[PDB]
Amino acid sequence: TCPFYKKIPGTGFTVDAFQYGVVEGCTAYFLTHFHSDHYAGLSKHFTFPVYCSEITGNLLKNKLHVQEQYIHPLPLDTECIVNGVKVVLLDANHCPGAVMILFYLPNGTVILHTGDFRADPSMERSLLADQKVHMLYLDTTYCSPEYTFPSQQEVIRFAINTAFEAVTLNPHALVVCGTYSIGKEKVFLAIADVLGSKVGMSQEKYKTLQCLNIPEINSLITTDMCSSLVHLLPMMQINFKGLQSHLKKCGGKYNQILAFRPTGWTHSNKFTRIADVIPQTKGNISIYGIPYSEHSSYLEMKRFVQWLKPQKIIPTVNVGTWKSRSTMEKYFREWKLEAGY
Ligand code: NI
Numbered sequence: 001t002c003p004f005y006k007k008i009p010g011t012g013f014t015v016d017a018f019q020y021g022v023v024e025g026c027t028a029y030f031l032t033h034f035h036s037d038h039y040a041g042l043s044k045h046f047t048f049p050v051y052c053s054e055i056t057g058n059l060l061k062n063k064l065h066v067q068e069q070y071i072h073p074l075p076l077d078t079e080c081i082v083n084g085v086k087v088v089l090l091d092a093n094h095c096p097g098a099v100m101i102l103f104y105l106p107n108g109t110v111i112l113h114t115g116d117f118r119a120d121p122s123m124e125r126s127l128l129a130d131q132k133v134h135m136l137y138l139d140t141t142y143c144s145p146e147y148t149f150p151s152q153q154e155v156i157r158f159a160i161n162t163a164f165e166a167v168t169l170n171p172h173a174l175v176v177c178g179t180y181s182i183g184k185e186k187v188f189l190a191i192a193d194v195l196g197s198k199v200g201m202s203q204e205k206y207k208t209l210q211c212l213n214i215p216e217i218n219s220l221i222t223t224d225m226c227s228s229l230v231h232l233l234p235m236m237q238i239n240f241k242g243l244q245s246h247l248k249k250c251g252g253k254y255n256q257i258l259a260f261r262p263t264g265w266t267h268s269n270k271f272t273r274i275a276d277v278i279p280q281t282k283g284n285i286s287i288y289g290i291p292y293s294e295h296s297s298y299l300e301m302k303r304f305v306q307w308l309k310p311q312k313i314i315p316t317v318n319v320g321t322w323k324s325r326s327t328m329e330k331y332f333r334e335w336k337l338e339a340g341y
Pocket residue numbers: 033035094116
């Protein structure tokens with residue numbers, strides 16, 4: 001049964017609610033983004049209207065085989081009427097195709113559902129600038145002040161400079177980047193651009209990337225692994241055993257691997273600056289964990305909420321324990337007392 005924080009009151013709508021069977025009263029199912037915890041339950045046998053971005057609808061049709069007649073893609077930044085209710089989709093600064101949803105309820109209430117997002121000051125000049133929000137359904141993934149990490153631009157600078165130095169020292173080094181979902185494509189694209197290479201990958205991953213409307217993508221990626229010196233592998237293979245096994249398959253073209261694991265936050269963020277990050281090394285294999293987040297830091301989240309000034313907040317992440325819920329509620333009250341709303 002569908003939980004309350006996935007239902008939009010005063011509508012027939014749900015958000016990210018595909019794993020509960022037929023939800024009573026639901027006339028349109030919204031999907032914020034193509035990540036498996038959110039699409040859990042969708043397949044080619046789904047027969048109710050799904051509303052989403054264009055990129056999410058390309059993934060639903062090609063990867064999950066949802067039939068076309070049930071996919072309803074909406075443009076961003078554009079007022080649309082769905083089943084008698086005005087909605088707008090906004091860029092969530094998460095993975096490709098990820099949106100926030102503004103719902104203008106028939107009674108005058110305005111609701112923002114963030115989906116998953118990485119808050120940014122640029123969102124203060126979207127269509128949110130123009131009206132009041134009563135209810136905020138908030139991605140609270142990192143809602144605690146211990147969760148710190150650098151900008152995506154600082155992380156990419158580190159990755160490019162590390163890869164360029166290694167390969168210039170040793171032209172026979174291979175670079176490997178781990179992946180297990182969409183998102184974080186700038187890591188491997190930025191590294192392949194500084195090295196003058198296409199990115200090599202499996203047919204299954206190539207197919208996924210071909211759905212993302214990235215400009216000039218045919219110039220940037222390939223299934224011909226022998227032509228590429230930046231390879232993508234499943235995240236599970238990014239360990240010394242898996243990397244050794246991969247290096248054997250490359251037919252003596254290479255004699256060293258430099259590998260990247262984009263994680264979110266890890267506890268080494270509480271001590272080490274991005275500049276000072278070092279790898280784990282075994283023989284001719286080195287592995288860097290890099291803190292590339294597609295979720296708000298605590299400070300980014302707090303800034304957004306203090307600007308928006310919602311009347312009520314409903315968390316959508318960390319909702320399963322009393323301790324997490326009490327912690328989040330204390331920070332919401334702090335923020336409100338500090339800013340005066
Ligand atoms: Ni996500």
